[PDB]
Amino acid sequence: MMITLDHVTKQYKSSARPALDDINVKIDKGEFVFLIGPSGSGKSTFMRLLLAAETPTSGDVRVSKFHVNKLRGRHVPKLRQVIGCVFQDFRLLQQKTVYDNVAFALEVIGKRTDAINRVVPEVLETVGLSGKANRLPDELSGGEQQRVAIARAFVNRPLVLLADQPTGNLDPETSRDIMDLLERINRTGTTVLMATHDHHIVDSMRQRVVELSLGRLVRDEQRGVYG
């Protein structure tokens, strides 16, 4: 089987409206899905549900490799090597350079230092951090501080790169190129999942756009646009 989850829900305490119904969603491998949902209701619990940050109350979340709804004492990172996760905030390290932030996510999973210099400097020149890559991220502008967070996710070649509000707070002049960067990971076969609240940018390429209203899916279009 491939990546398919259904019947997932997590009813929190003191919440008569947990905004998580049992929706049978279906995606395609190598296809991009845009989860432009509501505000403050359910745009992140579903987004962390693929990373299984919160244990669901019901249903069986599944990936194309193993079972996700049940774990053990040594299988929790085994889900999360293949997850490339980008938030709204930049969250770089302020004690190291841009060439070290990308490599920081490599010795934490047990990679030798000889393989660092043959893989890590073969990545950040593709995202656009080329030339010298020695500038400190504490002084760089936010246009280039986001793409290093993108390149930090694409280090072990993940098959999924889920992103929550990637543009976040940016002009369309510095967000139109973000689509041109993300399509280069999208055509590699990665099911990039973007949760956004910016219209008339996902209305251009007309890819698969889904949307929940207050806890239930209402739009399933494989080539739709945002309304």
């Binding site: 929790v76 990172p77 085994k78 999360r80 969250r91 996510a105 010795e107 934490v108 999973i109 930090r152």
Partner: protein, 295 residues
């Protein structure tokens, strides 16, 4: 084993909060070294009690009417007891004490109470020495109200009552050590809720990168272990300079009297491994389970 990655982050972690770090150093040094000082006075108590067992003398008194009318043991009442005591399995030798000399030997020892101490107030007695003077329960159930004795002194608890104020100091040190050790455990417990908070920006990412669950709290543990071991290291060093600067004249003034076991630097260094393992255990067991409820 990726040790060089752990070797350089700990300096940045110390520079993230050196204030809480040196606070934990101080409270660790005090709580551990005060328990070590409580152990040292326990060592001094029984080690200075043990230099008396070869010279402590058990004594049993006699009744008055076998000593009021005769000086030496010449009447047939004491002729039974004069060699009944040599018929024993744990007595070296028996020396009889005349009543005339047992009056003024106190006056010769100190010229005091030369007029008020009663002439018929010091009964005659014998001499018994035991291979087990601490375990003198043999004479407790044997020396009854025999015809010729007055009362049983039961060796002496005088040295045992005498060496009890420092026992009170020892369990005072133990009580204060446990009370401050609770605060030390609590300061370990909130070490990591500010150690993880000051560097959220990378512990919040290796959750969502794929790092192992054991390797998350390992650099938040190793810095606490280093803090504990340098706290114990300055604890013994501070106990050196409270022994050699404040108690030093007190112990050298008992040096000439030879009444104390004179605990030296080898004796405090003898308890250093047990003290160090106690510090490592108290900062390892309690800096681990506080991360199971945090991360």
């Amino acid at each position: 084993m990726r040790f060089g990655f752990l070797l350089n982050e700990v300096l940045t972690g110390f520079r993230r909060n050196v204030t809480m770090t040196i606070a934990m150093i101080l409270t660790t040094a005090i709580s551990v070294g005060l328990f070590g000082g409580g152990m040292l006075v326990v060592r001094l108590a029984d080690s200075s009690r043990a230099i008396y067992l070869d010279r402590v003398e058990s004594q049993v008194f006699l009744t008055e009417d076998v000593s009021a009318n005769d000086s030496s043991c010449d009447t047939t009442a004491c002729k039974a007891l004069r060699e009944k005591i040599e018929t024993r399995s744990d007595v070296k030798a028996v020396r009889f004490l005349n009543r005339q000399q047992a009056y003024d030997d106190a006056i010769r020892k100190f010229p005091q109470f030369k007029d008020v101490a009663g002439k018929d107030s010091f009964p005659a007695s014998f001499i018994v020495k035991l291979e087990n003077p601490e375990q003198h329960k043999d004479f407790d159930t044997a020396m009854k109200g025999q015809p010729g004795v007055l009362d049983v002194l039961n060796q002496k608890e005088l040295i045992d009552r005498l060496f009890a104020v420092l026992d009170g100091l020892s369990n005072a040190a133990f009580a204060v050590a446990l009370v401050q050790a609770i605060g030390a455990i609590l300061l370990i417990a909130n070490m990591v809720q500010v150690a993880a908070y000051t560097r959220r920006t990378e512990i919040g990412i290796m959750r969502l990168v794929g790092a192992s669950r054991w390797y998350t709290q390992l650099p938040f543990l190793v810095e606490a272990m280093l803090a504990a071991t340098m706290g114990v290291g300055i604890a013994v060093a501070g106990l050196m300079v409270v022994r050699a600067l404040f108690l030093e004249n007190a112990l050298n003034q008992f040096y000439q009297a030879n009444l104390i076991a004179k605990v030296d630097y080898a004796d405090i260094l003898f308890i250093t491994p047990w003290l160090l393992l106690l510090g490592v255990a108290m900062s390892g067991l309690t800096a681990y389970l506080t991360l199971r409820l945090y991360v």
